[PDB]
Design a protein around this ligand. Structure first.
Ligand SMILES: O=C(O)CCC(=O)C(=O)O
Ligand SMILES: O=C(O)CCC(=O)C(=O)O
Ligand SMILES: O=C(O)CCC(=O)C(=O)O
Ligand SMILES: O=C(O)CCC(=O)C(=O)O
Lengths: 446, 446, 446, 446
């Protein structure tokens, strides 16, 4: 909206000049998926495009150590975007960058570098990945200090209207801001859980899509904050209601044609689509710790009637792990329903790409589709069907990822080790906490 | 104290007559270790000694189903005891009983029956078990309604005096009450954690010891309640301070001689003592779910510098799972340090007895003792020494117990299945709870 | 009072029988001077007198490690005393003990053992030390929960009467209790600071005197607690008013004669008295960390007009480190004014004894006495007189103690190392704290 | 911005006339680094440029005595700057000045005079100093009366975005104001600690740089105040989070060439750079009391994992005292990381310049660089490498500065004596305070 997407640094400089841009937010994503930002003046942008932007990486989790901590951000001109919630006079813009070592080599601990490596691996087989993510978030009230709470903003449900849904203005302003940041909005609605909302944007290439995921998260948070609300991408902030997931629709392309499409097959799906699904189902347990990164992710991913915890695929069944929407042609896609919006999109999308590529290369059969309600099935029926489960908690997923040579190869040694160390520290802190539930259950019994 | 221990029902009736006993609390222990009590008049005691006391078992957890729920309690006269905190005029007494089916057979789901079966198994090899348990409990404040809290009664530490320890009167009254119930007090002190106390009573035969454990728990709770306090036997009611365990000292006897003693050996320990330790260490993972029954038990049993989570044995080392106090002769005993006071003493003591008997029968070598501080060791050093760990949470211990044929054989099918079902329901409820820790950690990040 | 002091275990057993003693508090002092107590029944006292009382030493600070943590307390019958604030029916008594290793050897980390070693060293030269300590304490209010505060109980001053001093009843009950515990009270009064009081008891042999110091501290604390007050032995609980010290009057005896007395000298002081003063003045900097153990001790020991921070000796001058009261004959004594009631009396008295013995053995001249008000002197005047200062804070005293071979020899390796480690941890925690004084001084200015 | 930097008094008068400037804030820096300001009308500015501005120096700390207290401020036209937060109509401008005695001689107690003396000393050897300081500050809430607090404005961390960082508007307005006051902003971001922010401006000549440091501090404070916040340059306002330092990047120049650069050397550093580092490392202990002036500075400078307390140098290691950024050519610089923003920039920069000049003149070898994480090293490993430590507290640094003839020569007798006297009074007041930490630690124990 009102600003054509720049491709080169010259277009970025012209846009900075003509849109009265004064501050440039040089941005990158850390290992755990948190956006890292610092502001440089627009006068320094020409020097930043040539020499990079130097920063200390020892204060960034998963990055370099304190002994060798100097790092450089190489700005990507195509990611240049003006923030619409910032003032228009002396405008503020963001540029995403790639993290580099001072010797000119890319930082292998950069998640964007991991996604680029997965993209290069796909291109070596002639494949290009398109990802359409569906992010759910909660809008909660802020307290008197403007700090986040879990207080509900409405008691609405799925597709609710009227004053049952009380965030039409917030979703409207989010949609406007996203269109200003180059998003193509498709739909926006109230989700199943109270105060839960989904805003769908158009799919794109996987690198641009992961950039869009981190951008979408911080844009939604900023717009919610300026209206007096808090936007939460916690997987399960509230008990008893629906959690927030990130349904990941993915499609493969080769020579301009959708790889997953085959008009000759009765199901209109190619053998390569089945191989991609088989690789995803084979490897999903090994990087559930990445697609579902936090302890709360497994408060969302509990067996029940909501969470895609059962490893399976189907066409229309929404109780299966993998869903294949009936769209055919260039729109043929595979939806992974396990991940939540707390995951690092670069690492998660890279790992799904690598799992699908491994399935295609090794010709992994996905098995028979599960067309029944797996939630209504019992453990005996699921055991007879061979329907396995995702890791039940963060420790189990850490253990699954630790022994995975596939995840270690796909992520690189730095990302693998630092991610596992951070998750291990998080679980070790969590596992010692005496929760109020235990006091309510045991104190007056024991 | 003041009442000689009755052995026959005639002695019980004489004591009821001469001590003005009006109410008899017929008591038993349920599957999870909770004392179950109801009061009959002393006039009905003569009929209750011949026909038993009939009760409904469908309202007792782990007991019979609602279709066949009539149950009979067969009173054991040796357990007759007058409660000292109850009024002396129209005195109140308790009798423990064995649960029987209406057809005259013992209820196989009775934990006391399980312990008696373990005792019979030991006697078939000529062994008799003596157990000395060391129970820790917390003394918390009561609220305005007299309900339990976790509010500290003092900030004292181990062996603290003065007003640093603020429960000398409560411990004094508990000691008096326990001596009235036939306990032989050995020591009483403030424990390591704030508001934590240990009262040690003399060892005895394992059946009387388990009776003493349940009696001690409810006596401490009653005495604390009448002084305006709450006695908590929760394994870990507070974070950051010491949890409460139940160190289980056990000794075996045959022909009047301590089996674990051997004056000829350099370490003054018989080969049967080593076999008992080997069986305990081999099987302890399979009934950690019994010795540590609740979710909070594994908030106590965390790797660190306090909890005996590492499967090992030693003589003086208190970082080992099994300790051998230097007492020899008839006082030679083996101390298991994993269990907490929330466990069912009948099932726990029966399982330790059966594990030790399996070790003696199969000549299981316990391996080399670990004389170093295992807490100061790293995971690499513990892996090099082969030092295994106890189950990290209740789910892992449930899984370990489920596949154990030893635990299933020792407990019987009814106790095994009902205990596992109750623990599974407990963990399934716990695992879905969104804790305030997750809100504090993730809400303003995600 | 009413109970003649027992000397043998038979006398103790007779006193237990005839005074209805039911609970025995087996007591000892840890490395930092804190009384450690646990209660055994009086029925176990005969066995405890023969085999000792076993306890875990790993939970006691400065004691053994967790790998070899079994310890035995050898009860001292002469220390047997009935606590008067405890009920008379089912009376409670205390017995102090010596800590022994299980192999029958004394524990070298026991402070009582350190004092006994100092006594043996003095006896090898024919000397016996008598110590008269003068303890000051504060009387503060209890809060609603009965926890310590610093709220003043009165605004009185030195030797104040009327309702200016509001603790005549507390001092009266303390005096009664102390007389019941074998103390010979000499005087009791309100001290200089508000809510500050001094109760003087008769001197005695140094081992009995240190026993009396720890006994006095916990007796005063208990009596204050039962009247709704808190007795604080903090060196400096309040700023701007007088701190609490422990003036240590010491006298040496040989062949029944006071060593420090000489009727032929003009000052009526023997050369051995001057040698003792010289040794004390030479070594006092090396164990100031023992006589003044905590950080708050040096908030008392600040240069000013109250604290004896200047290393000097004199006869009547109370601004000197060492004061010689004009009493002569058998009452000739040397008063060390630096220590506070927070010190371990066993270690402190042992170190003063060893410093004086080193002065006598090495013939150390104490120099000229300082008969002027050293507080009114300037730093230049004190520098010309050669008047050195005590360590300014706990860190400086720790550093002085570290390099002292005299203190290491006098305390033994275990006590030296563990005491220094505890003090180092205490100072390392203290030195990082951002105090509210810094916020008041710097926040609005920097 | 919008006002070209004046060089002569004629340019200042023209700017005053054309910008409607009515009030001139004649400003100077006192001995401890606090800006001292008073307002004269712009009509008096022509007379002030000729005769100076008379003021009373007895009310300024570190300045003249009350007997001879008349002082004159000689205005520096190059420092003329219009304050942007003051009204534009009847504009308010500042002029920095040099403090002079009435006899026309410069006041030797003026810190700006000390820096000018250091500059003259450097120019006598042909050197010119360029300093780039990196200042960290905290943004705290104001109370109801607009007084400073320590209440956090956000819980963000290093390089945080979104509403995690809640001070983008404050940083934006600070950047605008600094650009108005002649600063060239380079970067601005949220720092590691919560509510902590860093704004980087371009380096310059050392005199202009120290002027910029004091200007930056009061500009940040004014802008924060007008938005309802408090800007704190306190070294360690909060415990457990990162403190605020002032990393001092310095470069030397001779004949237009960076002295520290040498293309022939393998490390691209001249021998003079090593000499400068050696002089800095040799003398840093002697003026740590200047670079770290307050008691709180050593609550920041504690051994740990954050503070540069270990005397060492390296290239990329951020655990070293001295860092050498990889920039070469004219950008070669040496970063001293010990100082905090509470220091007097004139005295601090003068002392770093003099230490480096002494290193160059005396050919002081800096030793081997320390390329390992010194924070992860133990005291034994640091002692084997000869890695010394900075003074642990303000008293130790005062004692180090007392015996330094280098600091006395570099600062002059007046500044040296008055600075030491002020620091001595500060420490003497601090050392007597009974802190609440001591009450929490000792009151219930002693
Ligand atoms: O309801 C929404 O999703 C926001 C868009 C909209 O329809 C509106 O502006 O009300
Ligand atoms: O302190 C205790 O353990 C209770 C027994 C006792 O010594 C007392 O009565 O005070
Ligand atoms: O005032 C005192 O020290 C207590 C003793 C006394 O004189 C009294 O009982 O009032
Ligand atoms: O965030 C900042 O450092 C302030 C500058 C900026 O980017 C803005 O105006 O938002």
């Amino acid at each position: 909206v009102q600003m054509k997407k720049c491709t080169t640094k010259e277009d970025v400089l012209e846009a900075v000049k003509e849109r009265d841009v004064k501050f440039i937010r040089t941005q990158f994503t850390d290992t755990l998926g948190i956006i890292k930002s610092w502001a440089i003046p627009a006068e320094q942008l020409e020097e930043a495009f040539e020499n990079g932007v130097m920063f200390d990486g020892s204060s960034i989790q998963g990055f370099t150590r304190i002994e060798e901590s100097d790092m450089k951000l190489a700005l990507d001109p195509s990611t240049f975007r003006i923030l619409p919630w910032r003032p228009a006079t002396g405008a503020v813009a963001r540029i995403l960058g790639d993290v580099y070592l001072p010797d000119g080599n890319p930082f292998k601990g950069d998640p964007r570098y991991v996604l680029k490596t997965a993209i290069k691996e796909a291109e070596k087989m002639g494949f290009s990945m398109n990802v359409g993510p569906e992010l759910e978030f909660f809008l909660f009230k802020l307290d008197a200090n403007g700090n986040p709470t879990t207080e509900l903003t409405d008691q609405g449900g799925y597709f609710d209207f009227a004053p049952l849904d009380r965030a039409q203005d917030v979703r409207r302003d989010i949609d406007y801001a996203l269109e200003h940041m180059g998003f193509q909005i498709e739909a926006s609605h109230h989700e199943v859980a109270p105060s839960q909302h989904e805003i769908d944007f158009r799919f794109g290439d996987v690198l641009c899509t992961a950039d869009n995921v981190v951008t979408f998260k911080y844009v939604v948070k900023s717009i919610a904050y300026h209206k007096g609300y808090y936007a939460s991408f916690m997987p399960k902030p509230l008990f008893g209601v629906n959690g927030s997931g990130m349904h990941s629709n993915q499609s493969l392309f080769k020579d301009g044609k959708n790889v997953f499409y085959d008009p000759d097959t009765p199901t209109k799906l190619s053998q390569d689509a089945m191989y991609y699904i088989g690789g995803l189902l084979k490897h999903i347990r090994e990087f559930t710790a990445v697609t579902n990164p936090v302890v709360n992710s497994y408060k969302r991913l509990v067996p029940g009637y909501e969470a895609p915890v059962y490893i399976s695929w189907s066409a229309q069944n929404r109780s299966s792990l993998i869903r294949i929407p009936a769209t055919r042609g260039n729109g043929t896609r595979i939806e992974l329903r396990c991940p939540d919006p707390a995951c690092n999109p670069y690492l998660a999308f890279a790992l799904m790409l690598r799992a699908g590529l491994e399935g295609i290369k090794n010709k992994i059969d996905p098995g028979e589709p599960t067309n029944v309600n797996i939630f209504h099935l019992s453990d005996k029926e699921r055991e007879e069907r061979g329907i396995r489960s995702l890791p039940a908690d963060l420790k189990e997923a850490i253990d699954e990822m630790k022994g995975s040579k596939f995840v270690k190869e796909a992520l690189g040694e730095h990302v693998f080790s630092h991610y596992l160390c951070a998750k291990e520290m998080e679980w070790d802190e969590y596992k010692a906490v005496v929760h109020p539930w235990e006091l309510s259950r045991y104190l007056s019994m024991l």
